Each structure stands twice: as C-alpha cells, then as structure tokens.
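Section: Multi-chain targets

For targets with more than one molecule, the full set of components is provided together so that the structure can be written out for the assembly as a whole rather than chain by chain. Components appear in the order listed by the source. The example entry contains nine components.
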Amino acid sequence: IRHVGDALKDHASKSRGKICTIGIAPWGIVENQEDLIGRDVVRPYQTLTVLNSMHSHFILADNGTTGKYGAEVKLRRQLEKHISLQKINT
Amino acid sequence: IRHVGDALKDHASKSRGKICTIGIAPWGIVENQEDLIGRDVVRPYQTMSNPMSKLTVLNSMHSHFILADNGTTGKYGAEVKLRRQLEKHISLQKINT
Amino acid sequence: ARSQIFIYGQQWPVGSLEQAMLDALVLDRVDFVKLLIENGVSMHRFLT
Amino acid sequence: KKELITVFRMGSEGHQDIDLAILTALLKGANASAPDQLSLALAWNRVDIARSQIFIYGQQWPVGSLEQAMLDALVLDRVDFVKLLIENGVSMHRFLTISRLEELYNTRHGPSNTLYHLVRDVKKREYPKGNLPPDYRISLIDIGLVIEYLMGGAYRCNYTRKRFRTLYHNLFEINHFPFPFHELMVWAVLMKRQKMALFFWQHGEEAMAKALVACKLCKAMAHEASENDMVDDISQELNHNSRDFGQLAVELLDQSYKQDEQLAMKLLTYELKNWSNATCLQLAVAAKHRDFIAHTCSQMLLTDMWMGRLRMRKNSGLKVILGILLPPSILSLEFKNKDDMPYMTQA
Amino acid sequence: IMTFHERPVLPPPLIIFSHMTMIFQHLCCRWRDYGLKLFITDDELKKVHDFEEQCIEEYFREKDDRFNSSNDERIRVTSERVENMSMRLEEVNEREHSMKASLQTVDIRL
Amino acid sequence: ITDDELKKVHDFEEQCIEEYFREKDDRFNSSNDERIRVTSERVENMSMRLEEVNEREHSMKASLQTVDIRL
Amino acid sequence: RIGQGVPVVALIVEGGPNVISIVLEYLRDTPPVPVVVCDGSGRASDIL
Amino acid sequence: PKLLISVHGGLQNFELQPKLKQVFGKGLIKAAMTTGAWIFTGGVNTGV
Amino acid sequence: SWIERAFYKRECVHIIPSTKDPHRCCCGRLIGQHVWSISKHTQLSPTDAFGTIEFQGGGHSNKAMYVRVSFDTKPDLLLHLMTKEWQLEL
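Its structure, encoded as tokens over all components, is:
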C-alpha cells in the first residue's frame, strides 16, 4: 500500500487525473485515533501505523480490538462480492 | 508451410526481393476450389479459413502453385510422387557453370 | 487484441468481423483496421 | 562504544562509497534532533544526504522547526533545500509573513546584491539623510519605493498603498500574504538570486505577469548599476537575467497560443490587481519587449483592439471611409457583440 | 493604437469643439488609468489562472522531454551507463574466476 | 490504353508504393537518431540485467563457499 | 547558531598499535567523535 | 570549516588495492569539496 | 446525519483479561483506557468518527472522506454510502 501511495504521488505529478483508490483498514491499528473523531467535520491528520497520504477514501472497520488485524478481510470480501453482483451499465 | 509463410511475410516486410517459393499441394484439399476455376484469368482468393471445414486454404505469400489432382478430394498423397519426380528431373539438369 | 483475441485457435462467428470492421471504422481506430485487414477481412467483400 | 564506529567495506552493501559512510557517521555521532541534522546538511549543501537520511519514512518533526529550516534555507540561497522542504509539507501560504519577509530582505548571507544602493537612492530622493546608517532595517515600504522607481511610469506597488501602510503601522491571517510566490519572486529578483527566482516563477499563479515584471526589474537594475559606475559584470548578469525572463515570457505566450487562442487573449488583457492594475501587454511594452509584441497572438490582439466594436475584417479601409463620408453607410455594417471582447479604460 | 485610442473623436480642424467639451467637463468635475483592460469576473479569473497553470506545466515538461530526447543527452547517458557496465562486468569476470576455482576445490573435496 | 495496359500500370504503381514506404523505413532506420535511440534503450535493459546477474553471482559464490566449507 | 559546534570525524586507514589508543581517546571523549574505518588496507583496520 | 576530518594511519609506507585506493581517494576528495571540510593529516609524505 | 443513523460501531467493554501483560487486555488497549461478544463482550452504538480527513504534510494536500463502520455490516448500505453520499458513480 506504501508503493501504491508512491504511485499515487507520482500520479499527482503524472496528471491532475483522479483515482478513486478506496482503502479498507482495521480501525484499531491506526495512529492518532482521537485525531479522527468527529461527525461530518474536517479533521487534520499527521503523516501502530499511519494511513496512506495519497488515498481518496477510507472504509476503516472496527471489530472492537486495537492493534490487531483480521477486522477487515471478511467485510472487504463480501463487499467485493456485492459489487461484483451489480450489473454493469452495458 | 505456415512457418515458411510467416518467414516470407517478414521477408516482404523488410527486404526487396522476390523469393521463388513454389508450393505443391493436393488440388482436392484446398478450400474454395470453385473460386480457382478459370483459364488464364485472375481469380480472387480469400485468406479466411473456416475452422469447421477440414479443408485448408492455400498459403497467401507463395509465388507459384503446382496443385495436383489425382481425382480425390480431402485426401493427401496426390503430390508426393510428382514432387519427387520433379525434384529428380530438376537435379538431372546441368547448372550454368 | 493482437496478443490475446487474435491468437491461434480462436473461433470466429460468421459476420462478426465485418461488424467489428464497421465499429472500428466509425470510431477512428486505424490500427484496429490494420489488424482486421491483416486477419483476413477484405474490403471488397465488406464495403456495400 | 560500538555504535560510533562505522566500518566501510569494499564491495557488498557498505554504502558503495566513502561519503555516505562518513556523513551518516557524522549524523548519528551528533545524535541530536532532526532540526540539528537538517541544519548540518544545510551547512554542507548536501540535498541528497538530507533526502535519504533526514527525510526518511517515520521521522518525527517538532512543530515550527520546519519553517525555521525553511527560513534558513531561504536566506542561504539553497534552491534544492527549498524544493525538498516544499515537497515535504512546508507551504508558502502558512509560512511567509510580513516579519519573515522583512528578515529575508534584511539578510546578509548568500550572494551580493545592489539593493542597498537602491534603498539609499530612493531615501535620498524621498528626503533630500543621504547615506543610510549601517544598522538600518529596510522596511517593506522602502522596498515598495524601490519597485516603483524601477518599474517606472505610473506604477504603484502594493506596499506603498494606504492599506499596507495602515497594516504596517498597526502591527509594527491578516499578516499572511494571499499570493506569497509573487513576493518571493520580487525578493529573489531584487537581491539577484536568479535560480531562486526561476524556481519561484514555476510555482504560483500569474506567471506571465511575474516574468514580465521580473524582466523590467532586471533591466532597470542593470541600467541603475551601469549609471552608478558599479561593476560591469553585475550589469551584464542583470541583463542576462532580464533576457532569460523575457524568453520565458515569450515561450509561455507560445504555449498559450498553441493551446487556446481566446484564453491567450484573455491572459494578455485581464487587469492584474496585484501589479498596479496593469495589463500583460502594458508590462511587455514598458519592458520594451520587442519579441513579445511581435508574436502573432499580441499582433492579432492589437488588430482586435484596432477595429473597436466592429467585426468587419474583410476589405478594410474602404468600408470605414464610406462610413465616414456617408453616415447612412454606417448602419449597414456588421457590429460586434455587447460582451464579445470589451476593452475598456475605466469600468 | 494607444495614441489613436486616447485621441479625441473629432479631427484637428474641428477639434476645438471637442476641446471645449473636455474643458466644460473638467470644470464640472471641479465644481462637484491609461490603457485597455478587460475587467473579467471571478470564475473567468479562475479559468484563466487554471489555463495558465496548464500552460506552465506543459511548457516545463515539454522542455524536459526535449532535453531528454536530445541526441546529446542520449549520447551522455549511454556513455555513463556503458562505463558503469564495463566496471561491473570486470567485477563479474573476477567473481566467476573465483567461482571456477571454488568448483575445482569442491571437485577435489569430492 | 487498354484493360491489360491498365493491369500493367496497376502493378507498376504498387511497386512504386512498396519501394517508397520501405525505402523510407530504411532511411529512418539507417539514420543516426534512431540508431542512438535503439542503442540507448538496449543499454538500459542490458545494464539492469547485468546488475541482476552481479547480485545472483554474489549469492551463488556465497553458496559455493558454504558448500566447500561443509566438504 | 542552533546550538552545535562543528562536527569532527576520524578516518582510519591501516594503522598500527597506536591508532587503537587514538580510537579509544576519540570514542571515550566528551563530546564523542565518530570513527570511520576502511577495510582491505590491513593491520589495525582489518582487526577492527 | 563546516567539517573537520582527522586522518590517522600507519607511519610506515604501505600499498593497498587499486580499486580501494581509487574509491577512498574519490570519497575523501568529494567529501572535502562538497562540505568545505578541513583534512588533518600527518604532514610528511609517508603511507596514508 | 444519515451516516450515524445507518452505520453502527462497537466498543470494547469486557472483563479485561490480562493474558501476558496486565495493562494489555484481549483488545490490546490500556487497562484504564476503556470507555465480537466472545471474550470482548462488545457493545453496539452509533458512530462518532466519520467525515473528511485533511492530510497535513507529505507533499501534496489531499482531502479523503472516511467512515468508521462495524465489521459485521451488510455491504449494501456501504455501497449506497459510496454511490449516494460520496457521489461515486458505478
């Protein structure tokens, strides 16, 4: 994902083109969890591990636990299955 | 012969020469036989080959054809003896030296 | 399209390549026209 | 004490060079904070060392230290440190203030400049005194007086306007500059830092106006240096900088003419509120830029200015003569739209 | 163009009327910006600024592409790469001599 | 002229077309600029491959050392 | 003028028995001085 | 100076590998150029 | 206000099992920092961590919308979140 973010930084420098580059991460492993507490409020973030700086959206998933993985794989798999059942516009 | 035709395609794509590449095939096994009926008349030919048909088309980048008919269609063996006899008769001819 | 779709062993429906020629001609794809002519399509039998 | 000893090995992965080993050993032998390492790399003028060690992933940074290092890189004429600091999160909008810009104009590091002679001349002209004191702090108002003298004509710098003088008297995001790269362009042009000016030309808006202003400022400073019997190499270098900025403006005009003609007209004509309500054509004429006006876009713009509110543009001369001699021939002419291209003097 | 734009409408032999006009106007302005700008709006200003950044980016990276595609640049980059490659090949030759020696030694230990 | 003459000039202009495009390709390929470009991209690819071979030989020499030590 | 003196490095090539005492004097110093050694020359640098 | 380098080594004359000598020389020259350093040697024309 | 009323979250309220380290619980957080049901006994509630994130530093400034959701949420509401609130075409 760090190499993905470096690719996206080059892209920012490759063209103003916009990549919708959704990140699915566990909520418990993110640094500065209190920095991202709000309701439709713009929160500054500083660049447990940090989120990637060159991503566009986030689907941070909390199973309750802190500092552990496994909180996102099943949700990401089911969401990929659900979007794959959606019909294309053709 | 398909590999030889690809080689001749590359030859036509980068080199000025006309390679004499006389191919000898059975007459009854070539696709669209009625397309090649005429007497000293230029007949168009299709390089499409139908995968359902067992008959195969001629190679597109050959120079001359000695299509030999023993009467049968869709079977080989109508050209081997004639080709061997023609190669022997050519080799009997003396070179210009 | 050249490396995968037009590889050896690809079965083709009758009349579909002519429709692909029409679609490549209307959508300014000179290289797809080159590939389709090089894969057996003749203009004499196509242009009406 | 095994941690101080750095061992270089030929071949393998022992940095493949003496100097990464030496400078890395110095950086972790100091063992201080990353501002100290950044100031050391700034002193050594080693941008690659600071990029590959100090700005590695996961480096903790104190609040306000990056702006101090930005100021220190700006006063020492280090282009690639400013590029690296900008690429690592420092922004000009949150950094550049009035006091920091005044400190930049009053710095003594970096190369030499002829700004002090200009300040002395405009102070002698304003209050006929004479030589400035050695411990003189050059205010931004004096910088505004210097620009006006060099630009010339009826130019009025934003420093000398009543709003900026009121803000200066009441203080010495209101103190932040809305367009900081314009001020950094003017500061880098005035203290004769060509590479920093070329870096600041790329970043920010109103690039053509900045290039033409820099061209005229460099030409005026070259003329002032030749008039004051200074070193002739300074005048030659300032003329070279003026020609480089003029060539940049001409190439930008070529790119704008290649992309979109009408947007190039709109770039050439729109009023520059940050440059004394001027026009890029006026700035190019005031700079005596022969190649800018002789370009096709400026010539056809002047043709559009010539005809007024008339389409015409076919067999010119005879129809307007027939309109002048016969006033009933005027109404049979194709006039332009109400808002097609409204060149006005005072709106 | 600026001289004829700032000039009065009437020609010189009838210009005295126009002069009196300006005199009267000036007196009224006592009793109670030389150029031709456009005065565009804010969205048009943003469009002009974005067009300018597009042109700046285009000019800079076409200049970089012209510098990188220059026969001169290619001849330098090729030379440097070929020098570095000769250096490494020498190193690979040495390592392979050493490896053939080690193969002989292992055949001996066999 | 006749239909056969039409056929012969119809062949003649196609030797002219094929000779023009393929002499133009030969002029483009035998110029200096292209040859320099082809040489520079194959120096690109050959350099990286050679660095890779260097590293793989380092590893292989280490392996031969360990094997002979075991011996 | 941020609060640091000039940095001092100690490059060691080969050397004898005395340069080990020189390295000991450099490392056990306030402020400490880093020591960069080189390999392949021999003698004290190789044993280091 | 922005950097002080103290080169120490053996007083006896010695010969190193040619590539090692070239790399060490290029490193010392480049390090004293770019940082504007001061090199401190033993003075006399022996060894290091 | 739809994001809080549709997407849920879960919070670590357990018996604090020490295992290895006495401060580290089953969820790994600090023992006094508290406030699946197996050994975590987690409780379900509306979210209070969603909106927009402004990345300060790290080169270019990019805003990334974000949401914290439960790991057991059905993917259909998440897909309607991206298509409707987040203005993302299929």
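The two ends of chain I are 23 Å apart (CA to CA).
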